Amino acid sequence: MLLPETRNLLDLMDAATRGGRPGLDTLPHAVGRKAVDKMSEDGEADPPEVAEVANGGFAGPASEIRFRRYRPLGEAAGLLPTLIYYHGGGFVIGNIETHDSTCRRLANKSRCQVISIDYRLAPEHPFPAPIDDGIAAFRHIRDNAESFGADAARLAVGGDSAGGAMAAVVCQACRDAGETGPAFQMLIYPATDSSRESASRVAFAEGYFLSKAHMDWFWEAYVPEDTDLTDLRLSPLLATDFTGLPPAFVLTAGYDPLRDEGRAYADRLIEAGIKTTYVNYPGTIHGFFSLTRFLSQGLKANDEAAAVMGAHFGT
Amino acid sequence: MLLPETRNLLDLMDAATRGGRPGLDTLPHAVGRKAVDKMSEDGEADPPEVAEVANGGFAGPASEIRFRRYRPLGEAAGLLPTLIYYHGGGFVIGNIETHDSTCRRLANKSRCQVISIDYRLAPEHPFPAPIDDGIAAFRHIRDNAESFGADAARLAVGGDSAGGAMAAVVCQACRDAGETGPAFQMLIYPATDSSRESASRVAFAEGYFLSKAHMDWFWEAYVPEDTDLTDLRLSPLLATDFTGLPPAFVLTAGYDPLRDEGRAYADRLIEAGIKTTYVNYPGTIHGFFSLTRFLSQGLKANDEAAAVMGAHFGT
Ligand SMILES: *[P@@](=O)(CCCCCC)Oc1cccnc1-c1ncccc1O
Ligand SMILES: *[P@@](=O)(CCCCCC)Oc1cccnc1-c1ncccc1O
């Protein structure tokens, strides 16, 4: 069932709870963010060297959107294939600094450029603000490819949990509005359905790092009181038509509330005739893709994600 | 639906049929083999350079089994991670020379050693002869790892169509007999069920390179008249228990009679808690993995398979 390394980390977390570490769901949103942001930074493996890191901003829909570009070791070409990466944290926590090590590694193994986006967070900017920025970021980089050292032909989106949701909504938004969408979508244990509780959401609601308590706390902040839970920007799995979506890589963990909706999305793409890789990492938890200081499986996962995307773009 | 490159190749094949090229199913097995073996060789992309090719043999269960080792460019280590590769051809056609380009490329992209096996073919050696060699080959290389420059910890099996079937049976055989099986299984559009006709087997029985006519012609030669079609060496999908099988990569083509049984096997592994990558290449046909002179998708497929296996073994 659980890998030894996964069991060991859940035990260390339980030890810290009994030790007197507060629950994230007990703190106010702004205070809990600062606290968890430092713990996330410290859970990622030591950041590898890349060719070049660039830090900048551009005009968003209703604020400045900050980004970080990562140029991989050994790639001298001007315009590189590019992954636009949306960090996770339930549209409330996380930022560019929390997913830095992961992004550096993706860049090096894929031989692609990675552009990490810093979208607006709830509760200060609730739904639909974080998705509006993610879409604004894709459009800005698509239409200014050369500014970002990006090859417009080979421009990909991706992310983890809420960032995975964001990546999936960006493709659906671009398809539904008739414009040029990404060339590839990388969904790391994404959130694709708010309308229903799957078997995994019920089964792994307690004691597997991402709990129901956490998900309610994010929900409190992200969603204005009376919203249709079946809105495709909250629940992209309920989309009517999956044709004309870009080729997809989808990853799930075994002990992740989100496993079943992750795999359902993959099934919807496969049956609609979209080129699609699907991988399940059983015996590990939500977060493992960036908990790489404690979880070796996370590093192997980054490498599988990077490798598949390099194979698609011929890097 | 069909990619332009797939449509173009099926049209050239149809042109040659109307042109007066005989059907493979009309020729005797030995004559058809010689004819198709030269066409296969000529359908593979130009063979890349590798560090070193070794050609040799060893004592099989009831004959000499020939093998070819491919050491990849840039890998100086004595003992490498190793893929034991079983060519396809319905246990009747194919050999080391037909899958040479593919094997060289897998070796280079994966950073792994590849060992191509030359197993006994039907009708001269019918069922269960080709599987007996495949199993004998794995055991010989496992128990003489250093002789073959193989790291025993990281010793993988794989193959395409009949070779895919063989790879899957080798893992089931090693599990059922209680011994140390492969550490990874790479199934390229494998044959996993003889007991039933799926939707894909009926839908793509005519006009997609691999036809029912071809499959009956292989079957005529491979299977002695009265065999239980539900024998796990013919139908490894009907296995009762999938626990204790190695992590798997499984690849299917959209227009492949074998798609549905390929995907079913993947589903069985995922539900049993085996780490498992599943990829569908829609808009291309059975054989595309080695028809790489005409089909660019085949080259992208080799790279995805190589990349996933490199990520697993940390090459
Ligand atoms: P994701 O954004 C999960 C939220 C899905 C529900 C949509 C409203 O959360 C992540 C992602 C990556 C790494 N960590 C976390 C995380 N860490 C600590 C506590 C909670 C979460 O969600
Ligand atoms: P595979 O071994 C398909 C046979 C599955 C049925 C089991 C008895 O056939 C292949 C594999 C790779 C490349 N080519 C071919 C092939 N080429 C030409 C004609 C027929 C076939 O099967």
XYZ file of C-alpha atoms and ligand atoms in Angstrom:
674
model
C 0.000 0.000 0.000
C 1.968 3.126 1.311
C 5.707 3.389 0.371
C 8.014 3.478 3.453
C 9.095 7.098 2.546
C 5.391 8.246 2.427
C 4.591 6.525 5.804
C 7.716 8.130 7.403
C 6.667 11.680 6.268
C 3.010 11.299 7.457
C 4.485 10.087 10.853
C 6.837 13.171 11.084
C 3.788 15.432 10.312
C 1.664 13.658 13.019
C 4.621 14.022 15.495
C 4.656 17.820 14.730
C 0.803 17.999 15.253
C 1.070 16.294 18.724
C 4.224 18.494 19.160
C 1.968 21.622 19.078
C 2.012 22.712 15.368
C -1.330 24.504 14.667
C -3.737 23.205 11.962
C -3.731 25.369 8.761
C -7.604 25.294 8.898
C -7.484 26.976 12.415
C -5.436 30.077 11.264
C -6.744 33.108 9.268
C -5.915 32.893 5.490
C -3.122 35.589 5.347
C -1.337 34.276 8.533
C -1.600 30.573 7.477
C -0.201 31.488 3.997
C 3.075 33.067 5.361
C 3.492 30.013 7.705
C 2.858 27.272 5.049
C 4.854 29.164 2.317
C 8.072 28.736 4.449
C 7.262 25.004 5.074
C 6.675 24.428 1.289
C 10.026 26.150 0.369
C 11.729 23.803 2.944
C 9.999 20.619 1.557
C 11.447 20.990 -2.025
C 14.883 19.324 -2.822
C 17.973 21.662 -3.092
C 17.510 23.768 -6.262
C 19.713 22.597 -9.193
C 21.785 25.045 -11.352
C 20.104 26.214 -14.627
C 21.613 28.267 -17.523
C 19.715 31.466 -16.534
C 16.816 32.646 -14.251
C 14.949 35.854 -15.340
C 12.563 37.779 -12.961
C 10.053 40.311 -14.426
C 6.388 41.433 -14.662
C 3.714 42.458 -17.220
C 0.294 44.224 -17.281
C -2.409 41.743 -16.079
C -6.216 42.176 -16.473
C -6.476 44.166 -13.165
C -2.913 44.124 -11.572
C 0.795 43.299 -12.315
C 1.512 39.548 -12.956
C 5.083 38.519 -11.905
C 6.905 35.616 -13.668
C 10.225 33.729 -13.502
C 11.818 32.199 -16.664
C 14.184 29.199 -16.355
C 16.549 28.443 -19.271
C 17.878 24.824 -19.054
C 21.572 23.701 -19.019
C 23.015 22.987 -22.520
C 20.330 24.752 -24.691
C 21.956 27.628 -26.694
C 19.026 28.243 -29.182
C 17.283 31.680 -29.015
C 13.589 30.543 -29.014
C 13.037 27.395 -26.855
C 9.936 25.228 -26.365
C 8.309 26.680 -23.227
C 6.087 25.343 -20.394
C 3.966 28.047 -18.630
C 3.719 26.608 -15.056
C 0.914 27.447 -12.551
C 1.886 26.578 -8.907
C -0.651 24.884 -6.540
C -2.098 25.847 -3.086
C -5.930 25.838 -3.601
C -5.817 29.360 -5.222
C -4.904 30.680 -1.683
C -1.258 29.696 -0.795
C 1.920 28.996 -2.853
C 3.949 31.374 -5.100
C 6.991 31.346 -7.495
C 9.447 30.709 -4.556
C 7.552 27.562 -3.294
C 7.875 25.683 -6.682
C 11.374 27.012 -7.638
C 13.367 23.677 -7.216
C 10.681 21.717 -9.150
C 10.676 24.253 -12.053
C 14.534 24.317 -12.286
C 14.510 20.476 -12.467
C 11.629 20.310 -15.039
C 13.574 22.819 -17.245
C 16.876 20.785 -17.139
C 15.321 17.283 -17.686
C 12.833 18.439 -20.432
C 15.471 20.656 -22.194
C 12.543 23.211 -22.298
C 12.200 26.734 -20.882
C 9.807 26.967 -17.848
C 7.900 30.251 -17.084
C 6.431 30.216 -13.503
C 3.404 32.614 -13.158
C 2.427 34.561 -10.016
C -1.402 34.864 -10.264
C -3.718 36.700 -7.806
C -4.742 34.642 -4.694
C -7.951 34.426 -2.584
C -9.397 35.591 -0.311
C -8.091 39.097 -1.356
C -8.972 38.184 -5.031
C -11.676 35.447 -5.030
C -13.076 33.395 -7.993
C -12.843 34.138 -10.851
C -9.622 36.263 -10.329
C -6.843 33.560 -10.240
C -8.125 31.883 -13.497
C -8.427 35.334 -15.226
C -4.653 35.937 -14.600
C -3.640 32.412 -15.702
C -5.538 32.975 -19.006
C -4.142 36.565 -19.269
C -0.582 35.160 -18.765
C -0.955 32.486 -21.530
C -2.317 35.119 -24.026
C 0.403 37.693 -23.132
C 3.193 35.064 -23.709
C 1.549 33.520 -26.842
C 1.209 37.002 -28.487
C 4.729 38.136 -27.285
C 6.567 34.762 -27.733
C 9.968 36.266 -28.844
C 10.002 38.672 -25.758
C 9.969 35.484 -23.546
C 12.451 33.478 -25.738
C 9.522 31.101 -26.494
C 8.791 29.158 -29.757
C 5.040 30.006 -30.380
C 4.588 26.597 -32.170
C 5.698 24.696 -28.977
C 4.102 26.658 -26.092
C 2.727 24.372 -23.305
C 0.731 25.020 -20.052
C 0.772 22.913 -16.836
C 0.581 23.014 -13.023
C -0.099 21.018 -9.802
C -3.496 20.759 -7.916
C -5.114 24.252 -8.313
C -2.416 25.030 -10.979
C -3.464 21.789 -12.757
C -7.108 22.995 -12.663
C -5.861 26.377 -14.048
C -3.899 24.728 -16.936
C -7.005 22.615 -17.868
C -9.316 25.718 -17.770
C -6.800 27.715 -19.939
C -7.066 25.048 -22.750
C -10.915 24.865 -22.470
C -11.127 28.734 -22.416
C -8.883 29.022 -25.571
C -10.915 26.242 -27.372
C -14.390 27.678 -26.416
C -13.392 31.264 -27.496
C -11.990 30.004 -30.871
C -8.359 31.267 -30.319
C -4.964 29.382 -30.530
C -4.572 27.273 -27.329
C -1.412 25.668 -25.858
C 0.358 22.860 -27.812
C 0.470 20.576 -24.695
C -1.047 20.370 -21.155
C 0.851 18.888 -18.124
C -1.688 18.101 -15.302
C 0.026 17.062 -11.991
C -2.740 15.650 -9.669
C -5.156 18.397 -10.921
C -8.564 19.424 -9.387
C -11.168 18.962 -12.200
C -14.561 18.582 -10.346
C -16.166 20.670 -7.508
C -19.766 19.420 -8.251
C -19.204 15.883 -6.722
C -17.262 13.855 -4.086
C -15.556 10.820 -5.802
C -14.527 7.575 -3.967
C -10.929 8.972 -3.477
C -12.229 12.341 -2.055
C -14.264 10.414 0.624
C -11.692 7.592 1.249
C -8.619 9.923 1.728
C -10.405 12.900 3.458
C -8.295 12.412 6.716
C -4.595 11.627 7.426
C -3.095 11.859 3.871
C -1.632 15.441 4.077
C -4.400 17.002 1.875
C -7.534 16.627 4.093
C -11.212 17.789 3.729
C -10.477 20.413 6.468
C -7.736 21.943 4.177
C -10.061 21.828 1.108
C -12.947 23.582 3.010
C -10.457 26.259 4.250
C -9.339 26.934 0.593
C -13.037 26.845 -0.524
C -14.116 29.388 2.209
C -11.566 31.835 0.622
C -11.769 30.977 -3.134
C -15.558 30.827 -3.776
C -18.163 33.631 -3.421
C -21.208 32.232 -1.533
C -23.729 31.430 -4.384
C -21.774 30.084 -7.428
C -22.924 27.202 -9.724
C -20.460 24.402 -8.648
C -20.911 23.002 -12.246
C -19.321 26.164 -13.828
C -16.573 24.801 -16.211
C -13.992 27.213 -14.585
C -14.597 25.363 -11.232
C -15.394 21.915 -12.804
C -13.642 21.499 -16.195
C -14.301 17.668 -16.024
C -18.064 18.452 -16.711
C -17.115 19.948 -20.151
C -19.528 18.674 -22.892
C -16.890 18.226 -25.684
C -13.133 17.326 -25.260
C -12.207 17.490 -29.023
C -9.698 20.260 -29.957
C -7.896 20.114 -26.565
C -4.061 19.870 -26.737
C -2.167 16.607 -26.157
C -2.001 15.937 -22.383
C 0.221 14.308 -19.734
C -1.753 13.491 -16.522
C -0.222 12.304 -13.196
C -2.043 11.056 -10.041
C -0.971 9.806 -6.563
C -2.602 6.714 -4.959
C -3.560 8.388 -1.618
C -4.809 11.690 -3.106
C -8.434 12.837 -2.662
C -8.105 14.107 -6.295
C -6.943 10.769 -7.855
C -10.354 9.716 -9.314
C -11.188 13.139 -10.921
C -7.571 13.282 -12.250
C -8.013 9.862 -13.943
C -11.608 10.678 -15.151
C -10.227 13.803 -16.998
C -7.520 11.564 -18.620
C -10.267 9.049 -19.691
C -12.396 11.902 -21.211
C -9.341 13.085 -23.302
C -8.367 9.499 -24.439
C -11.936 8.663 -25.661
C -12.126 12.061 -27.530
C -8.994 11.061 -29.604
C -6.458 13.406 -27.875
C -2.865 11.976 -27.689
C -2.572 11.415 -23.909
C -0.100 9.907 -21.406
C -1.614 8.803 -18.042
C 0.563 7.728 -15.032
C -0.473 6.674 -11.487
C 2.107 6.801 -8.658
C 0.492 4.436 -6.122
C 1.757 4.402 -2.499
C 2.408 8.214 -2.402
C 0.344 11.334 -1.524
C -0.866 14.677 -2.963
C 2.078 17.167 -2.905
C 4.856 14.554 -3.591
C 5.791 16.325 -6.897
C 7.218 19.232 -4.786
C 7.876 17.424 -1.402
C 11.164 16.158 -2.933
C 13.381 16.735 0.193
C 11.494 13.764 1.893
C 9.952 11.846 -1.105
C 12.335 10.344 -3.780
C 9.227 9.330 -5.870
C 8.688 13.112 -6.452
C 12.077 13.388 -8.266
C 11.281 10.299 -10.458
C 7.855 11.975 -11.168
C 9.468 15.335 -12.251
C 11.754 13.255 -14.569
C 8.808 11.311 -16.111
C 6.863 14.634 -16.642
C 9.975 16.382 -18.103
C 10.894 13.355 -20.320
C 7.329 12.990 -21.839
C 7.222 16.764 -22.689
C 10.743 16.648 -24.256
C 9.638 13.610 -26.366
C 6.539 15.581 -27.644
C 8.533 18.779 -28.558
C 11.551 16.748 -29.863
C 14.034 18.506 -27.482
C -9.128 10.878 -37.330
C -6.083 9.431 -39.321
C -2.886 11.581 -39.487
C -1.919 12.613 -43.072
C 1.345 10.506 -42.768
C -0.729 7.368 -41.796
C -3.233 7.961 -44.703
C -0.315 8.399 -47.187
C 1.306 5.050 -46.104
C -2.000 3.053 -46.224
C -2.526 4.546 -49.776
C 1.017 3.448 -50.935
C 0.274 -0.089 -49.532
C -3.157 -0.198 -51.319
C -1.448 1.033 -54.570
C 1.029 -1.924 -54.269
C -1.932 -4.379 -53.654
C -3.835 -3.174 -56.809
C -0.326 -3.095 -58.451
C -0.120 -6.929 -58.082
C 1.776 -7.411 -54.745
C 0.535 -10.750 -53.270
C -1.240 -10.855 -49.863
C 0.958 -12.209 -46.987
C -2.016 -14.524 -46.069
C -1.823 -16.153 -49.610
C 1.908 -17.210 -49.337
C 3.310 -20.189 -47.340
C 4.790 -19.140 -43.921
C 8.549 -19.592 -44.808
C 8.227 -17.746 -48.207
C 6.097 -14.876 -46.758
C 8.631 -14.473 -43.862
C 11.695 -13.892 -46.175
C 9.570 -11.391 -48.234
C 8.165 -9.372 -45.248
C 11.537 -9.474 -43.324
C 13.152 -7.378 -46.161
C 10.135 -4.952 -46.206
C 10.343 -4.507 -42.358
C 14.155 -3.799 -42.486
C 13.412 -1.134 -45.194
C 10.514 0.482 -43.178
C 12.735 1.390 -40.118
C 14.477 4.878 -40.066
C 18.300 4.964 -40.766
C 20.062 3.216 -37.852
C 21.848 5.670 -35.491
C 25.423 5.089 -34.167
C 25.684 3.453 -30.686
C 28.832 3.034 -28.493
C 29.098 -0.739 -29.170
C 27.092 -3.647 -30.743
C 27.822 -7.222 -29.489
C 26.537 -10.344 -31.395
C 26.500 -13.752 -29.587
C 24.466 -16.830 -28.520
C 23.682 -19.009 -25.458
C 22.177 -22.468 -24.700
C 18.332 -22.219 -24.904
C 15.844 -24.821 -23.552
C 15.981 -26.831 -26.864
C 18.221 -24.780 -29.315
C 20.726 -21.822 -29.497
C 19.190 -18.361 -28.731
C 21.006 -15.473 -30.557
C 21.129 -11.938 -29.060
C 22.476 -8.472 -29.916
C 23.598 -6.029 -27.156
C 23.476 -2.251 -27.810
C 25.559 -0.004 -25.501
C 24.315 3.642 -25.761
C 26.434 6.737 -26.675
C 27.995 8.495 -23.624
C 27.586 5.685 -20.996
C 31.041 4.620 -19.646
C 29.781 2.506 -16.638
C 30.553 -1.265 -16.648
C 27.084 -2.600 -15.600
C 24.225 -0.609 -17.247
C 20.457 -0.763 -16.710
C 19.281 -3.187 -19.435
C 16.069 -3.705 -21.476
C 15.627 -7.280 -22.850
C 13.647 -6.585 -26.087
C 11.400 -9.166 -27.849
C 10.670 -8.205 -31.524
C 7.111 -8.623 -32.984
C 5.682 -10.544 -36.020
C 2.925 -12.799 -34.533
C 5.578 -15.356 -33.319
C 6.132 -16.154 -37.083
C 8.066 -13.266 -38.802
C 10.578 -10.627 -37.573
C 14.119 -11.094 -36.137
C 17.065 -9.038 -34.668
C 17.733 -7.324 -38.082
C 14.082 -6.073 -38.507
C 14.085 -4.105 -35.154
C 17.768 -2.941 -35.279
C 17.119 0.865 -35.897
C 14.419 0.958 -33.170
C 16.717 -0.809 -30.627
C 19.714 1.505 -31.376
C 17.422 4.553 -30.841
C 15.809 3.154 -27.614
C 19.368 2.538 -26.224
C 20.590 6.127 -26.984
C 17.437 8.010 -25.739
C 16.961 5.829 -22.556
C 20.721 5.844 -21.649
C 20.123 2.024 -21.124
C 21.646 -1.093 -22.698
C 19.213 -2.989 -25.023
C 19.544 -6.801 -25.579
C 17.442 -7.957 -28.619
C 16.530 -11.722 -28.361
C 16.191 -14.134 -31.316
C 13.513 -16.584 -30.147
C 12.211 -19.672 -32.032
C 9.401 -18.931 -34.577
C 6.311 -20.877 -35.774
C 5.322 -22.868 -37.690
C 8.682 -24.783 -37.327
C 8.434 -24.258 -33.481
C 4.750 -23.696 -32.544
C 3.213 -22.682 -29.142
C 4.566 -22.887 -26.517
C 8.143 -22.656 -28.041
C 8.616 -18.847 -28.572
C 7.471 -18.022 -24.953
C 9.749 -20.821 -23.518
C 12.809 -19.090 -25.147
C 11.739 -15.587 -24.014
C 11.508 -16.890 -20.393
C 14.784 -18.902 -20.817
C 16.484 -15.691 -22.135
C 15.359 -13.531 -19.140
C 16.559 -16.207 -16.605
C 19.917 -16.701 -18.427
C 20.573 -12.874 -18.365
C 19.226 -12.372 -14.782
C 21.480 -15.210 -13.416
C 24.504 -14.100 -15.582
C 23.977 -10.283 -15.287
C 27.727 -9.309 -15.301
C 28.395 -11.491 -18.480
C 25.889 -9.178 -20.334
C 27.095 -5.897 -18.697
C 23.658 -5.708 -16.955
C 22.815 -4.258 -13.467
C 20.614 -7.090 -11.959
C 18.665 -4.476 -9.865
C 17.590 -2.598 -13.069
C 16.840 -5.400 -15.591
C 13.690 -4.686 -17.689
C 11.735 -6.667 -20.378
C 9.656 -5.254 -23.279
C 8.569 -5.835 -26.903
C 6.018 -4.953 -29.648
C 2.818 -6.964 -30.546
C 3.828 -10.663 -30.059
C 7.016 -9.422 -28.259
C 4.686 -7.312 -26.009
C 2.653 -10.477 -25.239
C 5.988 -12.286 -24.508
C 7.236 -9.512 -22.127
C 3.881 -9.644 -20.212
C 4.004 -13.500 -19.964
C 7.671 -13.347 -18.736
C 6.587 -11.159 -15.720
C 3.507 -13.385 -14.985
C 5.721 -16.553 -15.311
C 8.394 -15.134 -12.889
C 5.664 -13.996 -10.368
C 3.690 -17.335 -10.468
C 6.920 -19.439 -10.017
C 8.018 -17.279 -7.005
C 11.358 -16.073 -8.552
C 12.823 -12.526 -9.152
C 11.054 -11.012 -12.214
C 12.023 -7.959 -14.319
C 12.110 -4.518 -12.597
C 10.039 -2.902 -15.438
C 7.836 -4.002 -18.409
C 7.519 -1.953 -21.677
C 4.425 -3.150 -23.696
C 4.245 -1.567 -27.225
C 0.713 -2.333 -28.606
C 0.862 -5.875 -27.037
C -1.472 -8.899 -27.698
C -3.013 -9.786 -24.266
C -6.286 -11.685 -25.112
C -6.961 -14.546 -27.626
C -10.238 -15.672 -25.885
C -12.352 -12.658 -27.156
C -12.826 -10.110 -30.013
C -12.957 -6.513 -28.575
C -14.616 -3.465 -30.287
C -11.181 -2.467 -31.810
C -10.514 -6.055 -33.134
C -13.918 -5.937 -35.022
C -13.804 -2.206 -36.038
C -10.193 -2.277 -37.488
C -10.224 -5.886 -38.935
C -9.826 -4.459 -42.540
C -7.744 -1.628 -44.088
C -5.384 -0.661 -41.184
C -2.202 -2.681 -42.084
C -2.795 -5.377 -39.378
C -5.977 -7.150 -40.661
C -7.921 -10.278 -39.473
C -6.466 -12.151 -42.532
C -2.879 -11.466 -41.200
C -3.875 -12.483 -37.612
C -5.469 -15.810 -38.812
C -2.305 -16.526 -40.918
C -0.074 -16.048 -37.770
C -2.605 -18.091 -35.696
C -2.624 -21.007 -38.275
C 1.191 -21.266 -37.662
C 1.508 -20.376 -33.927
C -1.269 -22.485 -32.299
C -1.643 -26.312 -32.253
C -5.277 -27.190 -33.165
C -6.907 -27.892 -29.703
C -5.482 -25.375 -27.142
C -7.496 -23.613 -24.366
C -7.625 -19.991 -25.776
C -7.874 -18.861 -22.064
C -4.331 -20.240 -21.293
C -2.460 -17.316 -19.540
C 0.507 -17.753 -22.009
C -1.943 -16.929 -24.899
C -4.236 -14.600 -22.829
C -2.275 -12.929 -19.979
C -5.143 -10.321 -19.631
C -7.311 -13.164 -18.079
C -4.802 -13.455 -15.143
C -6.648 -13.664 -11.755
C -4.072 -11.562 -9.781
C -1.981 -8.555 -11.082
C -0.240 -7.774 -7.710
C 3.578 -8.333 -7.685
C 3.989 -7.422 -11.407
C 6.725 -4.865 -12.232
C 5.995 -1.190 -13.002
C 4.692 -0.977 -16.604
C 4.673 1.414 -19.588
C 1.856 0.505 -22.089
C 1.437 2.101 -25.567
C -1.497 1.764 -28.013
C -2.275 3.071 -31.538
C -5.768 4.453 -32.328
C -6.391 2.247 -35.430
C -4.976 -1.007 -33.990
C -7.189 -4.105 -33.603
C -5.220 -4.623 -30.305
C -5.929 -1.108 -28.811
C -8.767 -2.202 -26.420
C -6.904 -5.306 -25.006
C -3.750 -3.124 -24.674
C -5.703 -0.545 -22.605
C -7.579 -3.279 -20.589
C -4.161 -4.740 -19.453
C -3.067 -1.185 -18.389
C -6.392 -0.777 -16.440
C -5.842 -4.171 -14.675
C -2.304 -3.052 -13.559
C -3.491 0.447 -12.376
C -6.368 -1.036 -10.233
C -3.886 -3.581 -8.673
C -1.629 -0.681 -7.414
C 1.275 -1.182 -9.918
C 3.026 2.124 -10.941
C 1.876 2.357 -14.599
C 2.188 4.797 -17.534
C -0.504 4.488 -20.251
C -0.199 6.384 -23.601
C -2.502 6.361 -26.655
C -1.151 7.497 -30.070
C -4.421 8.228 -31.909
C -4.456 8.708 -35.718
C -1.754 6.004 -36.343
C -1.675 2.199 -36.865
C -0.185 -1.035 -35.422
C 3.521 -1.289 -36.507
C 4.209 2.530 -36.395
C 6.831 2.007 -33.599
C 9.150 0.389 -36.241
C 7.700 1.893 -39.529
C 9.768 5.034 -38.763
C 11.001 5.699 -42.367
C 7.356 6.712 -43.289
C 5.778 7.545 -39.853
C 7.329 10.420 -37.760
C 4.910 9.489 -34.871
C 6.956 6.234 -34.493
C 10.128 8.260 -33.673
C 8.250 10.411 -31.065
C 6.880 7.071 -29.620
C 10.413 5.483 -29.312
C 11.495 8.688 -27.484
C 8.497 8.647 -25.066
C 9.119 4.894 -24.268
C 12.930 5.499 -23.866
C 12.378 8.664 -21.702
C 9.872 6.965 -19.270
C 12.300 3.976 -18.758
C 15.291 6.361 -18.220
C 13.214 8.293 -15.609
C 12.410 4.972 -13.749
C 16.072 3.724 -13.671
C 17.460 7.271 -13.035
C 19.784 7.117 -16.100
P -3.446 22.166 -4.311
O -3.704 23.513 -4.933
C -4.931 21.299 -3.825
C -6.223 22.107 -3.827
C -7.315 21.518 -4.726
C -8.692 22.089 -4.373
C -9.118 23.207 -5.339
C -9.773 24.360 -4.581
O -2.587 22.128 -2.923
C -1.147 21.911 -2.905
C -0.444 21.765 -4.122
C 0.940 21.531 -4.151
C 1.665 21.453 -2.963
N 0.909 21.614 -1.890
C -0.393 21.827 -1.681
C -0.857 21.953 -0.406
N -0.012 22.019 0.630
C -0.161 22.139 1.945
C -1.501 22.225 2.348
C -2.523 22.174 1.382
C -2.211 22.044 0.020
O -3.304 22.003 -0.887
P 2.766 -8.372 -34.145
O 3.555 -9.529 -33.603
C 0.989 -8.626 -34.152
C 0.506 -10.042 -33.881
C -0.420 -10.159 -32.662
C -1.237 -11.456 -32.714
C -0.646 -12.541 -31.797
C -0.614 -13.914 -32.458
O 2.999 -7.928 -35.718
C 3.967 -6.904 -36.092
C 4.737 -6.260 -35.090
C 5.698 -5.293 -35.412
C 5.920 -4.931 -36.737
N 5.151 -5.590 -37.584
C 4.205 -6.530 -37.463
C 3.589 -7.007 -38.580
N 3.989 -6.632 -39.799
C 3.602 -6.921 -41.038
C 2.509 -7.803 -41.089
C 1.952 -8.276 -39.897
C 2.481 -7.888 -38.645
O 1.851 -8.428 -37.476
